Enzyme design. Structure first.
Site, PDB file in Angstrom:
ATOM      1  N   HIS B  41       0.935  -1.295   0.067  1.00  0.00           N
ATOM      2  CA  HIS B  41      -0.047   0.037  -0.042  1.00  0.00           C
ATOM      3  C   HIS B  41       0.829   1.008  -0.152  1.00  0.00           C
ATOM      4  O   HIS B  41       0.293   2.257   0.007  1.00  0.00           O
ATOM      5  CB  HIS B  41      -1.095   0.019   1.212  1.00  0.00           C
ATOM      6  CG  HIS B  41      -0.628   0.332   2.563  1.00  0.00           C
ATOM      7  ND1 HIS B  41      -0.746  -0.533   3.739  1.00  0.00           N
ATOM      8  CD2 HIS B  41      -0.331   1.553   2.949  1.00  0.00           C
ATOM      9  CE1 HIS B  41      -0.242   0.245   4.672  1.00  0.00           C
ATOM     10  NE2 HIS B  41       0.024   1.493   4.363  1.00  0.00           N
ATOM     11  N   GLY B 143       2.900   7.191   8.687  1.00  0.00           N
ATOM     12  CA  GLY B 143       4.329   6.761   8.370  1.00  0.00           C
ATOM     13  C   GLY B 143       5.043   5.509   9.170  1.00  0.00           C
ATOM     14  O   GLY B 143       5.940   5.362   9.013  1.00  0.00           O
ATOM     15  N   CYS B 145       3.918   2.401   8.889  1.00  0.00           N
ATOM     16  CA  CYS B 145       3.608   1.207   8.323  1.00  0.00           C
ATOM     17  C   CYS B 145       4.907   0.703   7.758  1.00  0.00           C
ATOM     18  O   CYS B 145       5.886   1.789   7.443  1.00  0.00           O
ATOM     19  CB  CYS B 145       2.604   1.476   7.093  1.00  0.00           C
ATOM     20  SG  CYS B 145       1.033   2.040   7.704  1.00  0.00           S
TER      21      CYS B 145
END
Ligand SMILES: NC(=O)C1CCN(C(=O)Nc2ccccc2)CC1
Ligand SMILES: NC(=O)C1CCN(C(=O)Nc2ccccc2)CC1
Lengths: 304, 304
Positions: B41, B143, B145
């Site tokens: 993603h 941020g 992830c």
């Protein structure tokens, strides 16, 4: 979102842990530049520890009696000095992994990460508070002495704690990196009782702000209080008194959340007087006091 | 003595964190050998995230659209593939700090350390559990992830988690390092409700053993129970059922403390039925379920 008891990354500190052996006693040292720092009680047998004369014990020790080992390589000791309750072992090699660093003597209520070590090898990392009675509630077994407490500001490691003692009560005492004990503690195996373990009021309030920011709001009430009024309730509950400084430090969290500091004090007053009624806040059933206002801003903003 | 929610030392994992940027989306990657792993993603705008077609989105992406940065040096991307919900970015340089490592898909109830990162920079480390509903209760902002969960066995890092989603409920979901979500979760910004968050019974019992070993014994009672009897009380309290396997795993703690597992079950039954009555165990006012039996043996023996 979510809020967690978070340690600083331990990498920079892992790179500074060595094993220090004097006769039959092994513990941890901190290798920074060409100096290895360790608890001076590396020179005591447990028998010594009942009534050690550190000056007399040290006379019998030469540079070659300090065995300093970094992973599987030995460091040559070219010098040793006693500063307060630490030994400084001058080695012939600068630690090539020496980070930028300071020694700082922290204040009670301040938080730091501890890298628990055995034989110069790190086992784990956890976040701590210096209690108002200058004890810490650690996890420390035999060989953990010389385990250090630190904070990190971007790339600088501020070393603030070296572990020396477990008190007969199972709490921990130790020194700054200048060898000065936090509190009235001494490197002697004797009756040392800590004072009252008061709750770090400013930290609890910081953590109530963290809760609000993270969606846990059930404890917000319709009351406010004054500092004097709040501190009467604090006293009764062995909470540290709240000062205008504490209020000032909470200003940003106040601002961000739009909940005045004295309103939150009045929220906290009710929590103290009425308990949690079986409810939780950020997954806790008691009032957390090991996050500072700075800690909550850090974790709720995402500083690296 | 003392018992603490302790993370593994993060050093070996710090050395593998990079920044991954695709168009306007930046998040964290894991650099092992000549492969950077990140959540697929990274190729979604937040708008995409409502109904992403990952195959269609990926077609528009070339190796040169993945910006991989390690500290202040850029890595050349020579290859990219989608494996489940992760991207593998083949770079031209092997990470020189690649530790020994495995990918392992953990079981619910298992614990791991998380290195929270922003822009490939670690902010903190905390210990976690995989909840029985395959969520984790993390601390993750925008941020975060590609932040990874791991365990360490001496010098080998077993990577078990990569962070992908915050659920509308504020809990966290993500994948093993093969890109397979834990639980029924998908990398889509939609109604995904987690099931019942049951307590990890074996972990609570492990932690009651930790308490006993550390001097907190007030909750030991004069009762025993059976597995069937204990599991009737477990059910009512949304505790995971206790199996003979769980009993077997607790054997060593049983042995060390000389408290049979079923006696402790009966201690735990009373704690569930009667609550703590305002008392604490290892400084907690609720039953801790994020220490495994292995965790308690590790911390109460001092493994590095
Ligand atoms: N107990 C004592 O009187 C002494 C005090 C000084 N000392 C040293 O080793 N000093 C030293 C030597 C070489 C390089 C750097 C420092 C040993 C202990
Ligand atoms: N969406 C797609 O069909 C493709 C599948 C394969 N692919 C690659 O880049 N493969 C590759 C190239 C060089 C070295 C190693 C691997 C890009 C995405």
């Amino acid at each position: 979102s979510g809020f967690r008891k978070m340690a600083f990354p331990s990498g920079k500190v892992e790179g500074c842990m060595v094993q220090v052996t004097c006769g039959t006693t092994t513990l941890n040292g901190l290798w920074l530049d060409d100096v290895v720092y360790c608890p001076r009680h590396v020179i005591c047998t447990s028998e010594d520890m009942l009534n050690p004369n550190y000056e007399d014990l040290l006379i019998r020790k030469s540079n070659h009696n300090f065995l300093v080992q970094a992973g599987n390589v030995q460091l040559r000791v070219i010098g040793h000095s006693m500063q307060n309750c630490v030994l400084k072992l001058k080695v012939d090699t600068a630690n090539p992994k020496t980070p930028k660093y300071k020694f700082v003597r922290i204040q009670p209520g301040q938080t730091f990460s501890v890298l628990a070590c055995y034989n110069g090898s790190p086992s784990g990392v956890y976040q701590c508070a210096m209690r108002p009675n200058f004890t810490i509630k650690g996890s420390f077994l035999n060989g953990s002495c010389g385990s250090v407490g630190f904070n990190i500001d971007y790339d600088c490691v501020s070393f603030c704690y070296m572990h020396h003692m477990e008190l007969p009560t199972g709490v921990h005492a130790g020194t700054d990196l200048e060898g000065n004990f936090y509190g009235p503690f001494v490197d002697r195996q004797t009756a040392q009782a800590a004072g009252t373990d008061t709750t770090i009021t400013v930290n609890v309030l910081a953590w109530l702000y963290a809760a609000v920011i993270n969606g846990d709001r059930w404890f917000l009430n319709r009351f406010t209080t004054t500092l004097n009024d709040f501190n009467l309730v604090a006293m009764k509950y062995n909470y540290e008194p709240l000062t205008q400084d504490h209020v000032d430090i909470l200003g940003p969290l106040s601002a961000q959340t739009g909940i005045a500091v004295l309103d939150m004090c009045a929220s906290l007053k009710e929590l103290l007087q009425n308990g949690m009624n079986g409810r939780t806040i950020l997954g806790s059933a008691l009032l957390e006091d090991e996050f500072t206002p700075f800690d909550v801003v850090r974790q709720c903003s995402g500083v690296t």
